Motif scaffolding. Structure first.
Motif, PDB file in Angstrom:
ATOM      1  N   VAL A   3      43.790 -16.324  -0.385  1.00 19.49           N
ATOM      2  CA  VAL A   3      44.126 -14.902   0.222  1.00 19.49           C
ATOM      3  C   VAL A   3      44.101 -14.947   1.670  1.00 19.49           C
ATOM      4  CG1 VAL A   3      44.648 -12.527  -0.152  1.00 19.49           C
ATOM      5  CG2 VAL A   3      44.729 -14.553  -1.874  1.00 19.49           C
ATOM      6  N   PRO A   4      44.871 -14.310   2.903  1.00 17.49           N
ATOM      7  CA  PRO A   4      44.135 -13.939   4.390  1.00 17.49           C
ATOM      8  C   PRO A   4      43.805 -12.260   4.024  1.00 17.49           C
ATOM      9  CG  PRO A   4      47.136 -13.783   3.989  1.00 17.49           C
ATOM     10  CD  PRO A   4      46.521 -14.573   2.721  1.00 17.49           C
ATOM     11  N   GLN A   5      42.823 -12.846   5.409  1.00 12.20           N
ATOM     12  CA  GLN A   5      42.263 -11.087   5.020  1.00 12.20           C
ATOM     13  C   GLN A   5      42.404 -10.523   7.021  1.00 12.20           C
ATOM     14  OE1 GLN A   5      38.878 -12.838   4.361  1.00 12.20           O
ATOM     15  NE2 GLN A   5      38.499 -11.757   3.139  1.00 12.20           N
ATOM     16  N   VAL A   6      42.505  -9.375   7.140  1.00 10.33           N
ATOM     17  CA  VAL A   6      42.197  -8.843   8.140  1.00 10.33           C
ATOM     18  C   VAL A   6      40.345  -8.795   9.170  1.00 10.33           C
ATOM     19  CG1 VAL A   6      42.846  -7.272  10.058  1.00 10.33           C
ATOM     20  CG2 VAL A   6      44.487  -7.586   7.959  1.00 10.33           C
ATOM     21  N   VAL A   7      39.798  -8.362   7.767  1.00  7.63           N
ATOM     22  CA  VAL A   7      38.576  -7.832   7.587  1.00  7.63           C
ATOM     23  C   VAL A   7      37.850  -9.136   6.562  1.00  7.63           C
ATOM     24  CG1 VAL A   7      38.206  -5.974   9.366  1.00  7.63           C
ATOM     25  CG2 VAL A   7      38.540  -6.050   6.498  1.00  7.63           C
ATOM     26  N   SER A   8      36.389  -8.815   6.803  1.00  4.05           N
ATOM     27  CA  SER A   8      35.721 -10.167   5.069  1.00  4.05           C
ATOM     28  C   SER A   8      35.645  -9.114   4.725  1.00  4.05           C
ATOM     29  CB  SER A   8      34.599 -10.491   6.043  1.00  4.05           C
ATOM     30  OG  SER A   8      34.219  -9.753   6.721  1.00  4.05           O
ATOM     31  N   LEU A   9      35.663  -7.746   4.346  1.00  9.31           N
ATOM     32  CA  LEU A   9      35.891  -6.462   3.492  1.00  9.31           C
ATOM     33  C   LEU A   9      37.119  -6.640   2.616  1.00  9.31           C
ATOM     34  CD1 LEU A   9      33.707  -3.540   4.848  1.00  9.31           C
ATOM     35  CD2 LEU A   9      33.013  -5.913   3.938  1.00  9.31           C
ATOM     36  N   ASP A  10      38.320  -7.323   2.702  1.00  9.71           N
ATOM     37  CA  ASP A  10      39.412  -7.643   2.255  1.00  9.71           C
ATOM     38  C   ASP A  10      39.187  -8.180   0.742  1.00  9.71           C
ATOM     39  OD1 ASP A  10      40.916  -5.632   3.788  1.00  9.71           O
ATOM     40  OD2 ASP A  10      41.408  -7.427   5.604  1.00  9.71           O
ATOM     41  N   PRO A  11      40.230  -7.731  -0.321  1.00  9.19           N
ATOM     42  CA  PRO A  11      39.271  -8.277  -1.394  1.00  9.19           C
ATOM     43  C   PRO A  11      40.622  -9.533  -1.627  1.00  9.19           C
ATOM     44  CG  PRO A  11      40.331  -6.200  -1.611  1.00  9.19           C
ATOM     45  CD  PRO A  11      39.961  -6.323  -0.643  1.00  9.19           C
ATOM     46  N   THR A  12      40.107 -10.786  -2.383  1.00 12.23           N
ATOM     47  CA  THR A  12      40.436 -11.774  -1.917  1.00 12.23           C
ATOM     48  C   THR A  12      41.136 -12.407  -3.726  1.00 12.23           C
ATOM     49  OG1 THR A  12      38.573 -13.306  -1.905  1.00 12.23           O
ATOM     50  CG2 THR A  12      39.429 -13.009   0.161  1.00 12.23           C
ATOM     51  N   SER A  13      41.497 -11.356  -4.745  1.00 11.32           N
ATOM     52  CA  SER A  13      41.739 -11.584  -5.583  1.00 11.32           C
ATOM     53  C   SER A  13      41.652  -9.834  -6.808  1.00 11.32           C
ATOM     54  CB  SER A  13      40.372 -12.290  -6.160  1.00 11.32           C
ATOM     55  OG  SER A  13      39.813 -11.766  -7.507  1.00 11.32           O
ATOM     56  N   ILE A  14      42.958 -10.398  -7.504  1.00 10.91           N
ATOM     57  CA  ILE A  14      42.859  -9.275  -8.179  1.00 10.91           C
ATOM     58  C   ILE A  14      41.812  -8.904  -9.504  1.00 10.91           C
ATOM     59  CG2 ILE A  14      44.562  -7.794  -9.730  1.00 10.91           C
ATOM     60  CD1 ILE A  14      47.076  -8.937  -8.484  1.00 10.91           C
ATOM     61  N   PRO A  15      41.079  -7.997  -9.883  1.00 11.55           N
ATOM     62  CA  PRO A  15      40.610  -7.888 -10.665  1.00 11.55           C
ATOM     63  C   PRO A  15      40.948  -7.613 -11.942  1.00 11.55           C
ATOM     64  CG  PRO A  15      40.551  -5.822  -9.815  1.00 11.55           C
ATOM     65  CD  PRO A  15      40.906  -7.124  -8.755  1.00 11.55           C
ATOM     66  N   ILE A  16      40.928  -8.826 -13.084  1.00 18.13           N
ATOM     67  CA  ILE A  16      41.365  -8.781 -13.979  1.00 18.13           C
ATOM     68  C   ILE A  16      40.520  -8.553 -15.475  1.00 18.13           C
ATOM     69  CG2 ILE A  16      43.034  -9.964 -16.167  1.00 18.13           C
ATOM     70  CD1 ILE A  16      44.363  -8.452 -13.529  1.00 18.13           C
ATOM     71  N   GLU A  17      40.431  -7.491 -16.097  1.00 17.11           N
ATOM     72  CA  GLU A  17      39.392  -7.543 -18.241  1.00 17.11           C
ATOM     73  C   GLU A  17      40.566  -8.470 -19.453  1.00 17.11           C
ATOM     74  OE1 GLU A  17      39.260  -3.458 -19.118  1.00 17.11           O
ATOM     75  OE2 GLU A  17      37.771  -3.335 -17.121  1.00 17.11           O
ATOM     76  N   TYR A  18      40.389  -9.649 -19.427  1.00 19.59           N
ATOM     77  CA  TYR A  18      40.577 -10.366 -19.908  1.00 19.59           C
ATOM     78  C   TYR A  18      39.880  -9.753 -21.671  1.00 19.59           C
ATOM     79  CZ  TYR A  18      42.296 -13.664 -17.375  1.00 19.59           C
ATOM     80  OH  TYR A  18      43.636 -14.303 -16.104  1.00 19.59           O
ATOM     81  N   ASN A  19      38.779 -10.239 -21.477  1.00 23.13           N
ATOM     82  CA  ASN A  19      38.317  -9.116 -22.991  1.00 23.13           C
ATOM     83  C   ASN A  19      37.747  -7.686 -22.948  1.00 23.13           C
ATOM     84  OD1 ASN A  19      37.605 -12.179 -24.012  1.00 23.13           O
ATOM     85  ND2 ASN A  19      36.135 -12.107 -22.515  1.00 23.13           N
ATOM     86  N   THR A  20      39.114  -6.925 -23.366  1.00 22.61           N
ATOM     87  CA  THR A  20      38.681  -5.942 -23.866  1.00 22.61           C
ATOM     88  C   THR A  20      38.049  -4.953 -24.677  1.00 22.61           C
ATOM     89  OG1 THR A  20      40.793  -5.099 -25.209  1.00 22.61           O
ATOM     90  CG2 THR A  20      41.053  -5.445 -22.526  1.00 22.61           C
ATOM     91  N   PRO A  21      37.101  -3.824 -24.539  1.00 25.85           N
ATOM     92  CA  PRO A  21      36.963  -3.262 -26.234  1.00 25.85           C
ATOM     93  C   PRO A  21      37.032  -3.840 -27.205  1.00 25.85           C
ATOM     94  CG  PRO A  21      36.317  -1.833 -24.323  1.00 25.85           C
ATOM     95  CD  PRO A  21      37.028  -3.078 -23.951  1.00 25.85           C
ATOM     96  N   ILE A  22      39.302  -3.957 -27.109  1.00 27.03           N
ATOM     97  CA  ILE A  22      40.296  -3.024 -27.795  1.00 27.03           C
ATOM     98  C   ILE A  22      40.168  -4.479 -28.788  1.00 27.03           C
ATOM     99  CG2 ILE A  22      42.569  -3.041 -28.610  1.00 27.03           C
ATOM    100  CD1 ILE A  22      40.999  -0.853 -27.648  1.00 27.03           C
TER     101      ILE A  22
END
Ligand code: R5X
Ligand code: R5X
Ligand code: R5X
Ligand code: ZN
Ligand code: ZN
Ligand code: ZN
Ligand code: ZN
Ligand code: ZN
Ligand code: ZN
Lengths: 515, 511, 510
Positions: A3-22
């Motif tokens: 994933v290309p960034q403009v700054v190194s602080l730019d996130p490079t992935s989507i955070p995904i919760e698989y194991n939910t409390p449900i």
């Protein structure tokens, strides 16, 4: 891909919760004809009163406790009414000298609850779950619900109960571990439990993708999430990049993403049944990770550019459907989950209003407005879909803002070229309780897409029925296959609740399953 | 010279058709005082009736066919009238027992047809050509037209008949017969009309061509190709050269574009003593987004802005005509500072102060007023050539639509004689132009607090005049005229360019 | 005649000042040759430098040693001639009497334009307003023709004068002029005074608010003026207007509490009449725009008391004509006066109405009321059997985008009449530019149900479209149309110009 960034602080992935409390909640189903046990946690009765509106509360079910039964007797409960949405908390000691918590939620006076009424009941129940550290919830149905509405109850409960904190840092702040359900003919309802839990996550998965901001959810990172999902479900997958898209001559789709820093990524997931195939289905979702409008920038009052991360909702719904299908594993069917993912941005590299571009089927298109980019992406995706040689093509997209003027925020619109498929979508609507309405493709308007220089106009000059005109444009890219178009621009985002709905996941999955 | 791309599917050249079906039409001009013969194809009589508004149709000309003559008796035509634009088709057998097609176009009741009216006659005539598989058209003039209006008829016929299909994926006539009184003098107008036709249609092809096709690199390449197909001198000034010439106002506009600026300089020289040197300057903005002053307002019509190089297209169309007709005793310079006005991190900002090649510093009050900035540096360049006349043509101001509308272009200038010649050229080319004033009282609103001059005005809403006032600051001592074609360049009803300016500028150069 | 009121505090007449302090100014004009005397008040030299922003140099001989010393080149080169720049000093003269001397810079161009001369006068008037002078003396060291000189005096008088009729909670008495060939200029002096008041009278009507200036009181004013000048007069009320079948004009006034009033003033020469002229002025005392309300940004509804500037110009002309009393002409001063308001009785968008010439009109926009009132006025005018018809109107806001705020537009059906106007523009120094009536636009006024449309739906060339409309109501007479919407109100100075009085007067006299 990286994933290309403009700054190194730019996130490079989507955070995904698989194991939910449900997913950690143990669900037990009991038959009412055996009596209700009332112990730890909170025990809630779903109660109505047919005919007499705002009528008094009456508890029908046998309660296997002398103390509680005395408390819940009619003479005591008459001071409470069944006004839909009403809730009350009870506190008492049971036969074994232990303090128990009981209560009810009013289900009005109408014997048959609509999918909306059900949501209102669940929202009242969720209120009782919030700001209360409960280890167990027990629900007692004293209302008539079919198998589908029961499943819908569970899904809605699981969805609304869940809270997304993926992007919380300094502002956080216990889910139940057990869920008991008492209902008549319980054996007939048990099968819906794990179906509900599967439909829950498919919907909640799509929700996470839609809610995720455009700097987190970009075409590269989104396609990455699809690869990760396919790998976990053992789905076949293919991610087409720019070089492949060029040789496939996808000029309409490639144009939209020209002005983005993120290269275009075409997602192709496939589920094939281990038995001989009888039906082949293509599911196509609009996947614009952010819609700025292009040079036709969203600057007009009420254009809502800040919501425009939502513009890949169709892609999310399709991927959520992929989760439900890859998990439930339907037989004798092959499904293709497709999405032409890109970002519509303003740049020196962007395509211009007036540009003439060539779709993969050879049709030349005059762009009259860059903010009508969704149909352009879908055009090349639809050509791709038909090339797969399938029986049904169904697309789902946040295509036109006019849907808020036609059907509003509750009902989605379905368009198509084949009446039987339309009826199949509508049946999927009923069994999923995700409301959809059939809207016409008025051919009289087709002439307004006749371009002076190009083969076809992207937009109409005269006709203000953009939702229909857009459907006319899409139909031009499906030559000879049954095809349906679902517009979810109006219903994808829950404006009052400030969150996605993940609309379409359960509907598309019911479509796949019931066929 | 090499066109930059984002993706490989991006076009790298403007599709141009040079040999049109119109060029394949054999044209014959006969004198009516010898009779008309009919036979093959479609024969149309341009008829009128002086005095009576909707008076009856009266065929006066001699027809060399007993059958056709009997059919065209006054008594038979009496049921028809001559309302401007009226058209009818006839079927009959001639003396050769062959089926022939005859008809007429109503030319009204006025003895002298106007430019707008003649176009109405042509369009009605072209309608008769579009739905029929004809191999030959014959037109008999039973109305009075001078040589210019006759040529205009042919040009307008050719233009409206031709259909642009360069960008479509998914039967023209081969003969044209013309019967006319005093035919021998009209004959020379035919090939002049054919040349004027294409110069106009060459311009329209460029304008109609979308901005992904027609960019500063591809347009300048097209001009070079044109220059090579004729034999004009040509030089394309690149960024490096433009930097050495310090054309800062022009370089600023193109800063946000992925296409490097290209300055087009074409030259035609007569093979004899030059008595007049002329500089033609065309505004060449391939696409006008507005810059950071984005065209987002209702009615800004951004999807049209591919036409913002119409001025350049007009100048190139004139270069073709001049290159073809080879006039004498003149030296013409065909100039266009071409660039693209885009939104980018590299774009110039509202508030920026830029330096023109004549040294004057300019405060940019609005990035969408970019045409006059490229023109300013082009005017400085043009005057350094040491010419007698500087004429610029441009889609400069949207206020033209509120002043003169869609038919009449506006002309501004610092020299009455030059204006008179442009107005004269407007008459003979039948491309209408009205003279508008450069009001010096408004000049004070161009005074800047920090720069030498403001780009845009503070108070005055007469932008077509204010822009003219800004342009005049960059011509120190040369007769200069400015033609604003922002109102007339695009035919909204027909959804196509007019190619406005080609014939006007050519008439100006020839005479 | 009697002005209706909603409350007793509502005004029932327009306050007018006839005898202005300007009329008390004794003007003498001397020739520069022989030198200039400096003894009292302020003396201003009008100086140029034909370079840019060049030094000030006084060429004229001053018959006073002290002032001469002050005016020597070493002193004056400290100042510059930037157009409109001024300095003035107080000092004692040879007689030990207090005097003030200074200059107004006239730039570096030899021939001053009307716009240039106005900036000079504005600098001159600035000094007048903040000094308690008994006498101003102006020395012309620049070149001006007779017309520009008279224009200097008119503009000086007009800008100097302050309108204070609506204010609730010391002009000079002598004006001196040193100019080369003074004799040829003297006759312009009294003509300037007449042209000034005609302009000032008009400005008084325009500046007067819509509660003071209404259809009734404005017509009442016209009668009062007509009586002072011994012009015959006729005010047409609603009953007459109904018998004349003026439906277009009567429609516009339907929503007003003030009855429609048609002003008809006539000047006739004692000598045998050889030319008959009718001057038509747009007389909308207030223009809210009707149900097509002026509610869009920049519609300037708070200005719209100006919408009778045309009528004011015509009446201003009537003063000048009746005063200077030209020969061999009969002039008709006309105005269909009404008010454009929103009411239950108002005309609606869509309404089809019948003008007095039988033409049915589909109303597409109630804010385009001006041309409707003008339609019946033009019909009325032609019925008089005149040689020329000239209307003057604040008709189209599009004028601000074409010519702007300095040049008015003129349209017409007759080339000689338009040129006569253009010449009057030159000699009155009220700038007017000729604009075309493009016939190719006529087809947009073809109504589907009426004989003609009021407006165009497509074409945005509003001034030209409106010209085509009015053209339908003059059958066989030389007619010219002056759209003064853009030039009527001096926005910077927040006041009327009284534009058109001098223009139309020069037209009648020359
Ligand atoms: N007439 C015409 C012109 C240009 C665009 C549209 C149009 O439908 N535009 C849509 C778009 O941007 N697609 O990419 C669009 C616009 C707004 C929404 N919206 C939904 C919820 C809130 N807003 C959804 C889609 C129509
Ligand atoms: N005062 C001021 C402020 C900002 C822009 C202008 C202005 O004249 N803008 C013009 C422009 O963009 N030039 O590059 C412009 C605008 C619109 C058109 N138009 C023609 C047809 C329809 N619209 C043409 C030119 C003036
Ligand atoms: N087509 C069409 C639609 C609606 C209004 C007009 C129009 O020209 N309207 C004029 C009007 O109101 N006449 O009564 C009008 C006249 C003057 C101004 N103005 C603005 C500032 C100074 N003057 C504005 C409008 C035309
Ligand atoms: Zn969009
Ligand atoms: Zn979109
Ligand atoms: Zn621009
Ligand atoms: Zn431009
Ligand atoms: Zn109005
Ligand atoms: Zn008005």
């Amino acid at each position: 891909s990286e994933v290309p960034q403009v700054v190194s602080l730019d996130p490079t992935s989507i955070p995904i919760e698989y194991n939910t409390p449900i997913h950690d909640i143990k669900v037990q189903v009991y038959d009412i004809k055996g009596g209700c046990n009332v112990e730890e946690g909170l025990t809630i009765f779903l109660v109505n009163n047919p005919g007499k509106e705002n009528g008094p509360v009456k508890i029908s079910s046998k309660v296997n406790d002398k103390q509680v039964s005395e408390f819940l007797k009619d003479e005591n409960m008459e001071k409470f009414n069944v006004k839909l949405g009403t809730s009350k908390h009870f506190y008492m000691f049971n036969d074994n000298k232990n303090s128990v918590a009981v209560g009810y939620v009013g289900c009005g006076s109408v014997a048959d609850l609509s999918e909306a009424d059900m949501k209102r009941v669940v929202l009242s129940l969720v209120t009782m779950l919030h700001d209360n550290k409960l280890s167990k919830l027990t629900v007692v149905f004293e209302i008539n619900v079919d198998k589908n509405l029961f499943r819908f109850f569970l899904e809605t409960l699981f969805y609304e109960y869940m809270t997304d904190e993926r992007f919380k840092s300094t502002d956080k702040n216990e889910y139940i571990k057990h869920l008991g359900v008492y209902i008549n003919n319980a054996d007939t309802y048990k099968e819906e439990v794990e179906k509900a839990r599967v439909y829950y996550f498919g919907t909640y998965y799509a929700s996470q993708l839609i809610a995720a901001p455009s700097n987190y959810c970009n075409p590269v990172s989104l396609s990455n999430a699809a690869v990760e999902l396919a790998q976990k479900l053992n789905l076949e997958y293919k991610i087409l990049g720019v070089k492949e898209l060029e040789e496939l001559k996808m000029g309409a789709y490639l144009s939209v993403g020209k002005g983005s820093m993120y290269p275009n990524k075409f997602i192709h997931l496939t589920y094939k049944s281990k038995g001989d195939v009888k039906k082949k289905i293509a599911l196509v979702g609009k996947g614009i990770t952010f819609d700025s409008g292009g040079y036709n920038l969203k600057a007009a009052p009420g254009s809502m550019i800040d919501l425009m991360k939502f513009d890949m909702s169709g892609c999310a719904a399709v991927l959520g459907c992929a989760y439900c299908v890859g998990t439930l594993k339907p037989e004798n069917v092959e499904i293709h989950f497709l999405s032409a993912v890109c970002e519509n941005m303003v740049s020196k590299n962007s395509y211009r209003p007036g540009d003439i571009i060539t779709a993969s089927n050879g049709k030349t298109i005059e762009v009259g407005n860059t903010d009508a980019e969704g149909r352009l992406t879908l055009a090349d995706a639809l050509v791709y879909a038909e090339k797969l040689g399938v029986d049904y093509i169904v697309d789902i997209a946040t295509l036109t803002g006019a849907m808020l003027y036609s059907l509003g925020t509750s009902y989605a619109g379905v368009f198509g070229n084949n009446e039987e498929l339309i009826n199949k979508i509508l049946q999927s609507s009923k069994t999923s309780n995700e409301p959809v309405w059939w809207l016409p493709i008025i051919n009289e308007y087709r002439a307004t897409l006749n371009s002076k220089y190009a083969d076809i106009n992207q937009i109409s000059s005269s006709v203000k029925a953009s939702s229909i005109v857009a459907s006319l444009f899409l139909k031009e890219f499906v030559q000879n296959t049954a095809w349906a178009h679902i517009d979810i621009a109006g219903v994808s985002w829950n404006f009052k609740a400030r969150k996605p709905k993940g609309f379409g996941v359960r509907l598309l999955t019911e479509f796949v399953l019931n066929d």
